[PDB]
Each structure stands twice: as structure tokens, then as C-alpha cells.
RNA sequence: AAGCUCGUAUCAGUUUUAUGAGGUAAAGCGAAUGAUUAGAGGUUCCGGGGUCUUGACCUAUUCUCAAACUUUAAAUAUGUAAGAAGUCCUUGUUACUUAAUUGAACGUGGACAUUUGAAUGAAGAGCUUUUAGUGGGCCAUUUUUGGUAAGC
RNA sequence: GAGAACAGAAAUCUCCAGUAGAACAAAAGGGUAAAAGCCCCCUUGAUUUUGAUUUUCAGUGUGAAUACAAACCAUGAAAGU
RNA sequence: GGUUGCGGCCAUAUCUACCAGAAAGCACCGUUUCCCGUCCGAUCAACUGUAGUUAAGCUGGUAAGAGCCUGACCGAGUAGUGUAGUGGGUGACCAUACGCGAAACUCAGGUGCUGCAAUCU
């Protein structure tokens, strides 16, 4: 009655190799694709193999909530043609997938911007998840109220009319 | 017994050879081990054995030691 | 060379008890100390301020001064062939009330009560403690308790 | 979890495990200057739950905390306020109630009357020359986050206006802008008499009507418009200053009658004899 | 042990004193055990001493 | 050595009663950390040969250890207390403290005698001035470091 | 540990478990989890005047440290520090 | 007796897996004009108690549960140790005399108690 699955948030991640004009150019698309200003991430350490160093500002990402996240998810599922493997589903009830280009969603090519891929990840939960997030009397979710892999897969099949390999 | 006697010459000081009343390398007496084995309280794991206690969950002590 | 720092050789003395780390319970800060109280010293390792020197660990003294968060304690220290008085400024976390005399006050109260009740009736109030006395004569019965004979056991190995 | 992990685990304090008490803040709130001996320190405990506000005056003891006076927002309907028992103006009324109630019990209600001409002016309770000093309490917000315009400082404003001496600054009241170092008395006065709720009712009604019926439905049923709650808050303040004494709600049933009802729905533990029977029966199954 | 012997007034060999038997005095006797001989006097022994 | 102030007075290389402090001996490793023997049952789209072995881990066990490891933890040594400078009742002082004669400290006045607050002892207790020599040590039982050991 | 285009043992993103097995300029030992760690905001008390106390100790000095008094400040809604 | 606010001792209170919960309370939950804070009204802030739900939190119970606590002439007066001898033994070490006295192990029982204020078949 009050344990219906729902989308907590949708985070879009673009892992850029380096910083500079390349990273901020990739940050441009997320501004109008999600209607929110994204945030950038800096590398934890230095490898000297992938081409990054400490605090090099290598990545950019943004998360969205509400029905707008569902609209972006719908437009992102057209690339996969409502088809995902048996994988991509976590044991905690979350699922995600990645794409190779962003223009297919409807974004104009804009040679001044270029071509980028994106990572989509969806976090599923049930009403009452505030108990783990609230400051006072912070607690844990009961076992029967937790989201499992099977429940998310079944929920993913009843809607979107999609199939799992 | 003769094998341990020959080993004494390699050691300084005095050593004694004692026939233990335990069953092998277990800490149970010779007749006590017979009682537990015939009651189905002994299970073999590798070269040693595991015993059954009166403690713990029944669902774990029933799958093990089915004979008891 | 040798090392004689302030907290030398205090590896175990200033440790917390097992499964007793963390913050101090509030009853430590709610106790009231007044000049003349007898207190004992036990340093708390989690409070680095107002910490007594390792010599005074386990010593008992008398409060002579009370401050905002600390008290002043009088300690007699044996130096050479004489005793010298030492004054310590210690925070309340490192001290507690001494029970060596709280029980003595109870006997003082009890002596007066027994002194007063005997004042009207009986002479020889007898308000002095005595050590343990030798046992008096008694009779031991064997009804259902017949003595059982014991003997030394022979030597065995059972290894 | 392994057996070694459980054996070496140190459990926090019970109040810390439940997540209600901040012991870092409590130590500094409760500890008293040791040269003041048994002088109590009084906290103004203000806690906000759903559809309820609680205000208490509490001192500390070894056995436990002791309540000197208490006030609840659900007692407001006896003074005039029946809607919005958790808003900013409700906190002000509850804060005023606990201030007047505490002073009357101590006997200092004639002195330190407070202010009866509130207009959002920041001022402390000054002591009277050649007379007793005002009763002093310290605000205890618990785990509440300090933000300007929050309701917890609304109860602070009411208690200070009620005659109690509470030390505070004005930079956390509504109407303070970080750009300049001053307060706006007009905006603060608006929040005291529910100005922020009145403006919403006017604007919500002129924007959509299905929401103005879903919300504020109690106001429409009892015939209160958006320019009348100004007076009822003023009437409530005068009523509180008239009879601030506490009157308990009449008990329909006695305590022992309540106990008999509750024991019927409470499950009891088993004896050691019947625990052994369950094991024996389970073995034979 | 030297201090206990002084407190019992035994400062030279073949000296003797009477001691009341309590818990406070039985612990004194155990400290000087390898230096003294003691027992339970009789009436004749006390009279002749 | 010279004494001085006093003389029942408090003291004591001691015990007892009450109440503290400690991390050594021992003990422990299917308790943490670090060493360490042996198999057993599982686990890989994630080591490597080979169509099934050897390593890695995980689970329940097993043998043996620690001056610079430890949950537990002695014996012997060690702090304080056992009253007149004490306990109880009433109320005087203050610029300190309290919302407040509230509290804190120091007092006035009244009551309680030496089975007056455990044991034993007490060539009396307390105190001051001044100055000599000495400032190479060594031996024994027990504890113990370096060293094969030493009358080291 | 389970998940996400390039992406792999190690790039970034998400969830779960996690008594500290991390971190706290340095040697080592203590101490610390709504913190003493990480990030952010505001600051100069790392200030003025002289005494008492602890450690080494002759109860000298030096070094270091502890608790107050009388001022003047910083921070916070505040108790406080 | 149930519940809430503030606590005291800080596992008999923790952890794992299940089950139950009348009334009130608590909670989840609804909304974004205003104060306020964010990449995101998720956290934080404000507004309504209205649209809903006991699903979770929460409380209680169950388990030859893990852990924890208490006790025992359980192990054990064992290990260790103060004191003594012109005691034993080449030695290493050990026995006895007067005293003190463990830990592991085994077994049994237990699974929060309680102070202040308010409220409820
Ligand atoms: Mg705080
Ligand atoms: Mg040591
Ligand atoms: Mg040892
Ligand atoms: Mg001799």
C-alpha cells in the first residue's frame, strides 16, 4: 500500500580524461540537458598512466530528481531500445547504463561543443527512506522494506514494456 | 616406543616416554571417546574430528550430525 | 642518552579501560567539591588539560582551593628523609570523592545514637570497635553427618 | 558479524544510539562554575515535532533532569489559537506562555513584566535597580540547525519578551540580511502576528482555488479570513498574560484503569520451563 | 620482624611476655615466627613465672 | 657538642578494620596485533598450466609462541582515614556568589568527656644553632642486564 | 562487496557493510567519531600587567607545563571556548 | 501499563533472523508565496494537519542464536608468590614448613533498570 517503488534520483556522469577546455565543453551540455548547473570532480590521487594528477578536475556530473528525471530517463531509454542485460542491476536494487553519444537524445551537433558519451544511473527506493537521511533519530530500513535486485527487475518490466536479457 | 628411545640420544637432559590414555591426539579418555562415537556425536573433518554441543541453534546442529 | 620527560613510563597508566573510551559521563561534572573534602587522584587520559603528574596517580589529598573548572589539592610527598606539602591544580575529571572517610562519618552518627539511647538507661556505653575474637565453645552433631574417612591417593599420570 | 567483532565492540550511550542527545553540547550547557557550588543552571528546552511544540525549563541532577515549568502548543486552543500549532507565530505564543508561567511560580511576575508593545525591537531584559535580578535561562535547541528565521528562535523571542532574561543576538531572527549589520523591525513584527501566513492566503486564493480549498480548509469552515488572524494573535497574547497558570486536562479514566487496558495488548515473556519444552518438542518433530 | 619484636618488648634472647590473642596480634606473631617460640600457658606456669 | 620550650603528649621501618591506586609473576591466542604446523569444506566473466591441478582468499577446526603483544590478572611492596583543630542545633558578618538571605567562608550562643571512638609499644615529646670526618667501597641470600664463561 | 560508454587491478558516478583496521607536520607511546579527523565561514588570545603552582630539584637556576586574578579582544543564537 | 520531551547508569541496553502492535503519541507522508540552504525543497528552512499509511522507523515477543552480565567447594587450593632450614640434587631444578592465592576451562541462571514533567481505554 505504501511500499511502491519509485526513482529517488538520476545522476548523469561524464568522466573526462583531462581538464581545461575539454572538461568545461562537456559541462555545457548538462546545463541544458538537465536544466541544472552541474558540478565537477577532482582526481583523488596521481597515476601518471591515465594522464591525471591530484586535484586535476577530471570529471563532471549532475543529479536530478522529480518527474524531470523520468523524462530524461525515457529519452535515454530510446538509445537502448528498452533492452538491458541481466547485469546492470545491482544487488541493492539500483540499475544504470551508459551511452556513446549525446546528440541522439535530440541535442544539436554544435561543432563548437563536439561529441560526448554519458553514464546514466538510477537509484530506487520506497517511501520512508528519510529515516536514513534525517539528522535526528537516524536509523535503518527494515529487511522487508529494502529494494532487491529481483523487485527492481520486475518493476522495470511492468512499465516501459522492456525486456531483460 | 623404540623409535622414541633412539631419539632421546639426540637431546640433552632427561626425557621420559609415557603411554597416553587418550584416544590419539584428542583430549578425551579412551572409554569416553567410545561413548561419544557410538552416540553419533563425532564427525570427521580432515585428520581431526568435530564434536556436538548442547549450545547453538538447532537448525545448525540438525543438518550436521544427522544420525544424532 | 637517558629520557626523563614529563609523561615518561606512562604507557599503561594513562590508558582508558577496555571498552570504556570516549566522552566522560555527566556525573563527573555535576559533583560538588568544597574546601576540606578528601579526594583521590586518578588521571583520565582523554583530558590532556589539568592532568596530574604520574607520581600523584593513586594518591589521596585534601582540597584547599576551588576554581571554575579545577580544584586545589594538598599532597604530602616524601623527599629524602622528610615530607613536603605539594599543591596541585587539577581539573575535576581527574579526581573523585574518597570513600575512605564517608563510612567513618556513618560510625560517628551511629555512636551518638547509641550514646544517647544509653544515656538514660545503661552505664558503659562501649562505643569502641574490637578486632576479631577467638571462637567460643560449640557442640558439633553427627546426626546425618557421620564423618567420612579420607586417604591420600596413589600417583597417576593421566597425560 | 564475527564473534571477535561483537566482543570488542563498545556501545555508545543509549541517548546517542537513539540519536536524541548531543553530549558534546550538553556538557557545556550543564557544567556549572565549581565556585558556585549547588547553583542550578536552567536551560530553555524547545523541541519541534510534527503538529506540536514543546517548551520546558530544566535543571540537572545526578538522579536525573528536573522540570521546573512546561508549556505545550496543543494547550493554545484555550487562549484563542486553534490553527497552525507549529508555525512561527505559534512558537512565539508558546515561548510567551512558558515565560509568564515560570515567573508567576517563582513569585517574580509583578517585576519584569516584559514588553506589551512588541514591534520587532531587539532588546534584553534589563535588571531593576535595588531589586532582584531577572530569572536567567539558556536556550537549548538540541540537534536543530541554526538558521536565520527558524522557528526555534521564535520561541526565543517570545520567552525574552515575557520577562525572562535570555542572552541572544539578533542576527538569527527573520528580517536580518547578511549584507548589512542591522535588523528590520517591520519584517520581524510581521512574523510575530502571522504576517507570512496571511500574505500566502491572499496570494494563494487569487492564484488557484483548488489549492486554497485543500490547504487552509479549517479557516474556511470556521470563517477566518486573511486579515483576522492579526487580532486573534493579539488576543491570545493578552489572554496568556492574564492567566498563564497551567491547568491539566481532565482525565476521563484513572491510571489503574489505563493499565488494565494496555496489559491486554502487551505480549509477555516465557518461563525457562516452557523454553525447554519448545526445544524438546522441536527435537521430536 | 625487628620492629615487631620491639613492639612486643622482646629485645634480647630468652625474654618473654604475655600476649592477648586477637586478629590484630595473630598477624604480628606470623611475622616473627622464625625468631620466637610461643604457646598456651597453664595456671602453674603463670604462677611460677 | 651546646642546649632551648614543655611534659602526657602525640608519635611509630608494626598489625587490624574501611576505602584507593598498579599491569609484574602467572595466564591467553577456536579474544585484538604480530609470529606459526597440519589438513578439511567452499569460492573466480578477476592468477597460472591444463579440461582440470597448483596458488590465492573465505568458513568451521588443529599444533606451538612474544622484553619493546594482550581481554583477564595475583603475591610482596604502596596512598588515605579511624574525632575536641570532632559532631549536632540556633543564627551574626561580606564589596564574593544566587532569580531570591540562596550559597560559600569565617564566627557568636547552647548541648555532648576521656571503653572520647581499633591493636601493640612509647630511655618523654617538640624545636633551634653550629661544626667534624666522608663523598675510591666490597661481600652473601633473593630479583636481574651484557657476556660461552669468569674470584668478570 | 555489488553496479555504470570508452574504463582495464588502480580515472569518475551510485548503493550496502564497515569500533576506526584511516587521519591528526615529525620518533615512539597515549588520546580522539554528530571529533581532536575532512570541508567551509569568521578571526589574531601566538595579546597586556605582575604573582602562585607542577616536573627535573639542593625543593637553586634554565626549559617546558598547569590553575586563577586584573584588563583588552576573537568566535558562537547561546551555554561556553 | 502504553506513548512523548529531558535525562541518570552506559550492551542484562548491542548484533543477526523472524513475528505482533487497540487507544493516544511519535513517525512516514502533502505543498513551495514568504525567511533560509542546496548540482538536486534528497538533507536543511518555511507552510498545512489538510490528501493518505502503519509499509518502514519505533516498541514488544520468539531463537538448545552470537555477544554481554552474574554466580558456583566447575577447574583449583592447581599455577604463581612472601617468609624459613648447615633440606634434596654434580647441575638444571625440586620437596617440605608458616602464610596469601589466580586466569583459562566447565556448568547454571539472566537479557535493561530507573528519575522529572505531560498525555492516553
Ligand atoms: Mg552545536
Ligand atoms: Mg611495565
Ligand atoms: Mg610470562
Ligand atoms: Mg640463616
Amino acid at each position: 500500500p505504501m511500499r511502491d517503488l519509485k526513482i529517488e534520483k538520476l545522476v548523469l556522469n561524464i568522466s573526462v580524461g583531462e581538464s581545461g577546455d575539454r572538461l568545461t565543453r562537456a559541462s555545457k551540455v548538462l546545463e541544458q540537458l538537465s536544466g541544472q548547473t552541474p558540478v565537477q570532480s577532482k582526481a583523488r590521487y596521481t597515476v601518471r598512466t591515465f594522464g591525471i594528477r591530484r586535484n586535476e578536475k577530471i570529471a563532471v556530473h549532475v543529479t536530478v530528481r522529480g518527474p524531470k528525471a523520468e523524462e530524461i530517463l525515457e529519452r535515454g531509454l530510446k538509445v537502448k531500445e528498452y533492452q538491458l542485460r541481466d547485469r546492470n542491476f545491482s544487488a541493492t536494487g539500483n540499475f544504470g547504463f551508459g551511452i556513446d553519444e549525446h546528440i541522439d537524445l535530440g541535442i544539436k551537433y554544435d561543432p563548437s561543443i563536439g561529441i560526448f558519451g554519458m553514464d546514466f544511473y538510477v537509484v530506487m527506493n520506497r517511501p520512508g527512506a528519510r529515516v536514513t537521511r534525517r539528522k535526528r533519530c537516524k536509523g535503518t530500513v527494515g529487511n522487508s522494506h529494502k529494494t532487491t535486485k529481483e523487485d527492481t527487475v520486475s518493476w522495470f518490466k511492468q512499465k516501459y514494456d522492456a525486456d531483460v536479457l | 616406543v623404540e623409535g622414541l628411545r633412539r631419539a632421546r640420544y639426540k637431546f640433552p637432559g632427561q626425557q621420559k616416554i609415557i603411554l597416553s590414555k587418550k584416544w590419539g591426539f584428542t583430549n578425551l579418555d579412551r572409554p569416553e571417546y567410545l561413548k561419544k562415537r557410538e552416540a553419533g556425536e563425532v564427525k570427521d573433518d580432515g585428520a581431526f574430528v568435530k564434536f556436538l554441543s548442547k549450545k547453538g541453534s538447532l537448525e545448525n546442529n540438525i543438518r550436521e550430525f544427522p544420525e544424532y | 642518552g637517558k629520557s626523563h620527560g614529563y609523561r615518561s613510563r606512562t604507557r599503561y597508566m594513562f590508558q582508558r579501560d577496555f571498552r570504556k573510551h570516549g566522552a566522560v559521563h555527566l556525573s563527573t561534572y555535576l559533583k560538588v567539591y568544597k574546601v576540606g573534602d578528601i579526594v583521590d587522584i586518578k588521571a583520565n587520559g582523554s583530558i590532556q588539560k589539568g592532568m596530574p603528574h604520574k607520581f600523584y596517580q593513586g594518591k589521596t589529598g585534601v582540597v584547599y582551593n576551588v576554581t571554575k573548572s579545577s580544584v586545589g589539592v594538598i599532597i604530602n610527598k616524601m623527599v629524602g628523609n622528610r615530607y613536603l606539602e605539594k599543591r596541585l591544580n587539577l581539573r575535576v575529571e581527574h579526581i573523585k570523592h574518597s570513600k575512605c572517610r564517608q563510612e567513618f562519618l556513618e560510625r560517628v552518627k551511629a555512636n551518638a545514637a547509641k550514646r544517647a539511647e544509653a544515656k538514660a538507661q545503661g552505664v558503659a556505653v562501649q562505643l569502641k570497635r574490637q578486632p576479631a575474637q577467638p571462637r567460643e565453645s560449640r557442640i558439633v552433631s553427627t546426626e546425618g553427618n557421620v564423618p567420612q574417612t579420607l586417604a591420600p591417593v596413589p600417583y597417576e599420570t593421566f597425560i | 558479524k564475527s564473534s571477535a567483532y561483537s566482543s570488542r565492540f563498545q556501545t555508545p550511550f543509549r541517548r546517542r544510539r537513539e540519536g536524541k542527545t548531543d553530549y558534546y553540547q550538553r556538557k557545556r550547557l550543564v557544567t556549572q562554575h565549581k565556585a558556585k557550588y549547588n547553583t542550578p543552571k536552567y536551560r530553555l528546552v524547545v523541541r519541534f515535532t510534527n503538529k506540536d511544540i514543546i517548551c520546558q525549563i530544566i535543571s540537572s541532577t545526578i538522579t536525573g533532569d528536573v522540570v521546573l515549568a512546561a508549556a505545550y502548543s496543543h494547550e493554545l486552543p484555550r487562549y484563542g489559537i486553534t490553527h497552525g500549532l507549529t508555525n512561527w507565530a505559534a512558537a512565539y505564543a508558546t515561548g510567551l506562555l512558558i515565560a509568564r508561567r515560570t515567573l508567576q511560580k517563582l513569585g517574580l511576575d509583578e517585576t519584569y513584566k516584559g514588553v506589551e508593545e512588541v514591534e520587532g525591537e531587539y532588546e534584553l531584559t534589563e535588571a531593576v535597580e535595588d531589586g532582584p535580578r531577572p530569572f536567567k535561562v539558556f536556550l537549548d535547541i538540541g540537534l536543530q540547525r541554526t538558521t536565520t528565521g527558524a522557528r526555534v528562535f521564535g520561541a526565543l523571542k517570545g520567552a525574552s519578551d515575557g520577562g525572562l532574561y535570555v542572552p541572544h543576538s539578533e542576527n538569527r531572527f527573520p528580517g536580518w540580511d547578511f549584507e548589512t549589520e542591522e535588523i528590520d523591525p517591520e519584517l520581524l513584527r510581521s512574523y510575530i502576528f502571522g504576517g507570512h501566513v496571511s500574505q500566502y492566503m491572499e496570494e494563494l486564493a487569487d492564484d488557484d482555488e483548488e489549492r486554497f480549498s485543500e490547504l487552509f480548509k479549517g479557516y474556511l469552515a470556521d470563517d477566518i479570513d486573511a486579515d483576522s488572524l492579526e487580532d486573534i494573535y493579539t488576543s491570545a497574547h493578552e489572554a496568556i498574560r492574564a492567566d498563564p497558570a497551567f491547568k491539566p486536562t481532565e482525565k476521563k479514566f484513572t491510571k489503574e484503569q489505563y493499565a488494565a487496558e494496555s496489559k491486554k495488548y502487551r505480549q509477555t515473556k516465557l518461563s525457562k520451563e516452557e523454553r525447554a519444552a519448545r526445544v524438546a518438542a522441536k527435537i521430536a518433530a | 620482624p625487628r620492629k615487631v619484636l620491639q613492639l612486643l618488648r622482646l629485645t634480647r634472647i630468652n625474654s618473654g611476655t604475655f600476649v592477648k590473642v586477637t586478629k590484630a596480634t595473630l598477624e604480628l606473631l606470623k611475622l616473627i615466627e622464625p625468631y620466637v617460640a610461643y604457646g598456651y600457658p597453664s595456671y602453674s606456669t603463670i604462677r611460677q613465672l
Side-chain angles (χ1 to χ4, degrees):
Chain A
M2 203 184 163
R3 49 181 299 178
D4 295 325
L5 270 301
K6 60 177 184 58
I7 296 177
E8 178 175 351
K9 54 182 176 185
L10 171 62
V11 49
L12 324 179
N13 188 25
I14 300 181
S15 62
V16 187
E18 63 279 358
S19 182
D21 182 78
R22 180 73 180 277
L23 173 120
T24 180
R25 200 161 69 257
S27 174
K28 297 298 185 302
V29 57
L30 298 179
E31 177 184 0
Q32 62 267 2
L33 192 146
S34 63
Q36 303 178 189
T37 159
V39 294
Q40 297 81 351
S41 302
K42 297 186 292 185
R44 296 180 301 175
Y45 43 79
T46 307
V47 62
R48 293 100 63 93
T49 300
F50 309 118
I52 59 184
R53 63 185 186 272
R54 176 188 171 93
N55 299 125
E56 214 262 339
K57 198 77 72 63
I58 69 175
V60 53
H61 71 277
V62 62
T63 177
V64 293
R65 305 176 191 269
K68 190 174 190 178
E70 189 268 352
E71 297 178 351
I72 304 184
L73 180 63
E74 289 276 8
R75 197 161 64 258
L77 284 175
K78 294 180 57 177
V79 184
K80 297 300 179 178
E81 200 62 31
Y82 289 151
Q83 190 172 5
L84 301 174
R85 308 178 182 182
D86 181 77
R87 57 198 299 265
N88 310 315
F89 285 89
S90 303
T92 58
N94 300 332
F95 72 98
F97 55 91
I99 63 180
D100 296 73
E101 66 282 352
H102 65 128
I103 52 178
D104 46 359
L105 273 63
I107 300 300
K108 187 175 301 179
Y109 181 82
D110 196 355
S112 302
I113 294 296
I115 299 301
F116 284 104
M118 288 185 299
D119 282 325
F120 294 167
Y121 205 85
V122 184
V123 183
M124 302 295 298
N125 55 356
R126 307 175 188 263
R130 168 173 165 77
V131 302
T132 324
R133 305 287 181 174
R134 63 189 182 190
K135 178 57 178 295
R136 185 177 185 268
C137 300
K138 187 176 306 181
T140 176
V141 178
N143 290 334
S144 58
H145 200 65
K146 290 177 182 177
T147 63
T148 57
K149 179 181 178 179
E150 51 181 6
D151 300 337
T152 301
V153 170
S154 297
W155 172 90
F156 184 75
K157 290 183 182 179
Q158 306 309 316
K159 51 187 304 179
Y160 308 105
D161 296 326
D163 51 355
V164 175
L165 280 71
Chain B
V1 166
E2 180 59 35
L4 292 182
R5 283 187 65 261
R6 305 164 73 90
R8 290 199 297 189
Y9 297 99
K10 314 294 181 177
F11 288 142
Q14 179 186 8
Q15 294 82 203
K16 291 184 179 180
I17 303 176
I18 301 181
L19 295 171
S20 180
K21 53 183 57 180
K22 302 299 184 180
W23 181 286
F25 291 163
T26 64
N27 289 326
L28 301 178
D29 292 325
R30 181 72 72 96
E32 181 63 30
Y33 180 84
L34 294 180
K35 178 181 301 301
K36 291 194 183 306
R37 186 179 62 178
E38 293 301 321
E41 309 179 26
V42 181
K43 183 191 61 180
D44 308 338
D45 51 311
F48 200 59
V49 290
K50 291 180 178 300
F51 307 97
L52 176 64
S53 59
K54 305 296 184 57
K55 297 295 180 299
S57 61
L58 279 176
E59 52 270 15
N60 292 333
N61 292 116
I62 283 179
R63 45 165 293 179
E64 302 164 348
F65 304 102
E67 183 181 0
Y68 184 86
Chain C
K2 296 288 186 173
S3 180
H4 297 105
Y6 201 85
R7 284 182 53 171
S8 58
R9 310 169 187 174
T10 62
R11 170 168 179 173
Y12 300 101
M13 172 178 295
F14 290 164
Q15 283 183 12
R16 311 301 308 276
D17 299 328
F18 182 64
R19 292 195 286 107
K20 288 184 175 57
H21 294 259
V24 186
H25 52 74
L26 265 301
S27 57
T28 295
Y29 299 96
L30 293 182
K31 294 184 176 63
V32 182
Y33 300 93
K34 301 195 301 183
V35 171
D37 295 333
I38 299 183
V39 303
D40 60 73
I41 306 178
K42 181 190 180 65
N44 182 10
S46 63
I47 309 299
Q48 288 79 216
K49 292 181 178 298
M51 205 173 187
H53 185 261
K54 56 165 173 294
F55 170 81
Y56 304 94
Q57 173 80 358
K59 296 304 173 60
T60 304
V62 183
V63 177
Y64 80 97
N65 191 38
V66 180
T67 28
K68 180 178 65 62
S69 59
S70 303
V71 303
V73 188
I74 295 292
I75 303 290
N76 293 323
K77 182 179 184 179
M78 208 291 297
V79 181
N81 60 272
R82 73 201 181 280
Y83 282 95
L84 298 181
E85 57 164 348
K86 313 294 290 184
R87 304 205 170 189
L88 302 170
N89 299 326
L90 305 181
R91 287 185 176 266
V92 299
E93 296 107 335
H94 307 281
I95 64 162
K96 72 171 62 179
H97 281 93
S98 176
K99 294 163 56 181
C100 68
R101 198 176 168 266
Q102 177 58 226
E103 54 89 14
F104 161 73
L105 304 173
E106 310 296 337
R107 185 162 49 89
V108 174
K109 184 73 172 184
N111 291 341
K114 285 179 290 184
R115 189 184 193 92
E117 61 88 22
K119 184 63 180 179
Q121 286 77 208
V123 204
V125 290
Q126 202 268 320
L127 268 313
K128 282 190 181 183
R129 295 174 298 166
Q130 304 285 7
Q133 298 296 144
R135 298 185 296 264
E136 301 292 324
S137 60
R138 64 176 59 95
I139 305 179
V140 183
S141 177
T142 52
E143 299 294 337
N145 197 13
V146 176
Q148 300 300 135
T149 305
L150 303 177
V153 305
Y155 173 76
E156 294 172 1
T157 311
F158 53 83
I159 192 59
Chain D
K1 298 179 180 62
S2 57
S3 178
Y5 173 86
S6 302
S7 185
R8 301 180 61 85
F9 184 86
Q10 176 180 352
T11 60
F13 294 162
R14 177 176 57 83
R15 301 284 293 177
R16 181 59 187 90
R17 303 193 307 265
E18 301 171 357
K20 297 178 182 178
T21 302
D22 190 86
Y23 282 94
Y24 190 92
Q25 181 186 11
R26 172 170 174 80
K27 179 261 170 184
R28 291 148 183 80
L29 279 170
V30 173
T31 301
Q32 171 67 284
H33 192 129
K34 289 305 165 190
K36 298 178 182 176
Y37 299 94
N38 292 267
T39 294
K41 295 189 66 175
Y42 295 96
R43 301 140 54 205
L44 174 55
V45 176
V46 183
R47 294 298 180 269
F48 288 92
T49 77
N50 295 331
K51 68 185 63 181
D52 197 3
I53 304 177
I54 307 181
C55 296
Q56 292 169 326
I57 308 295
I58 298 180
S59 64
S60 298
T61 325
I62 294 292
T63 314
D65 277 341
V66 175
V67 175
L68 183 59
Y72 292 81
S73 67
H74 60 67
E75 306 287 352
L76 289 180
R78 79 180 292 260
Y79 294 101
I81 308 177
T82 61
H83 293 65
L85 302 182
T86 347
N87 69 97
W88 204 100
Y92 190 95
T94 314
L96 174 58
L97 178 61
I98 189 63
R100 304 309 305 177
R101 182 169 299 174
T102 305
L103 288 175
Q104 173 175 341
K105 183 176 301 180
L106 291 173
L108 284 78
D109 52 327
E110 292 79 24
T111 320
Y112 305 105
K113 288 294 184 178
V115 287
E116 295 81 359
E117 202 252 348
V118 289
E119 279 193 349
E121 293 292 337
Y122 165 71
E123 51 194 357
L124 290 315
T125 302
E126 55 187 4
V128 290
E129 183 185 4
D130 291 359
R133 297 179 299 178
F135 190 69
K136 175 168 55 60
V137 301
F138 313 110
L139 177 61
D140 189 334
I141 71 178
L143 297 175
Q144 173 67 23
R145 185 174 305 184
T146 291
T147 49
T148 158
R151 293 173 300 176
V152 66
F153 308 110
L156 165 67
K157 192 71 185 67
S160 183
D161 285 0
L164 296 180
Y165 174 72
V166 197
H168 64 275
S169 293
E170 74 290 347
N171 61 88
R172 289 306 178 183
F173 289 145
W176 178 280
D177 56 330
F178 300 155
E179 291 75 20
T180 180
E181 198 79 9
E182 71 253 17
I183 189 62
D184 187 11
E186 196 280 335
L187 203 158
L188 181 56
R189 187 184 183 273
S190 180
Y191 268 81
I192 296 183
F193 295 139
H196 61 295
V197 181
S198 300
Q199 297 195 253
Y200 192 25
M201 294 172 54
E202 294 285 352
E203 296 174 351
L204 181 66
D206 304 332
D207 179 69
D208 44 50
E209 295 173 330
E210 68 285 353
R211 291 268 299 277
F212 191 80
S213 179
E214 181 65 31
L215 302 174
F216 301 102
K217 183 161 61 182
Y219 288 89
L220 304 180
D222 298 332
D223 292 326
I224 293 100
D225 43 356
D227 59 347
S228 179
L229 65 92
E230 171 74 22
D231 182 72
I232 68 182
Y233 285 153
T234 303
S235 303
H237 295 350
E238 185 175 1
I240 289 176
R241 294 180 177 269
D243 184 64
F246 171 76
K247 297 302 299 179
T249 67
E250 57 91 17
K251 295 296 178 297
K252 303 179 179 59
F253 303 140
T254 58
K255 288 179 295 181
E256 66 276 9
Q257 293 180 219
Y258 287 134
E261 181 73 19
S262 299
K263 294 176 182 180
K264 294 182 296 183
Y265 300 95
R266 179 188 60 174
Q267 195 168 352
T268 185
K269 301 172 64 63
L270 298 179
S271 177
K272 60 174 182 296
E273 287 78 359
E274 40 192 343
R275 285 195 298 265
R278 293 163 61 99
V279 174
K282 191 173 179 179
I283 293 180
Chain E
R2 186 177 183 179
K3 178 65 177 181
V4 181
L5 292 172
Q6 296 173 10
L7 293 179
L8 291 187
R9 302 188 298 167
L10 304 174
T11 56
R12 78 185 71 186
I13 190 175
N14 295 335
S15 283
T17 46
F18 292 102
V19 173
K20 184 187 188 300
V21 178
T22 55
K23 177 67 175 182
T25 59
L26 282 182
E27 308 304 310
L28 292 179
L29 295 181
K30 299 199 301 185
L31 290 172
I32 59 173
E33 185 171 358
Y35 313 101
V36 303
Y38 65 95
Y40 311 131
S42 68
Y43 175 75
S44 57
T45 298
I46 298 174
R47 182 177 181 267
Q48 292 182 1
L49 277 171

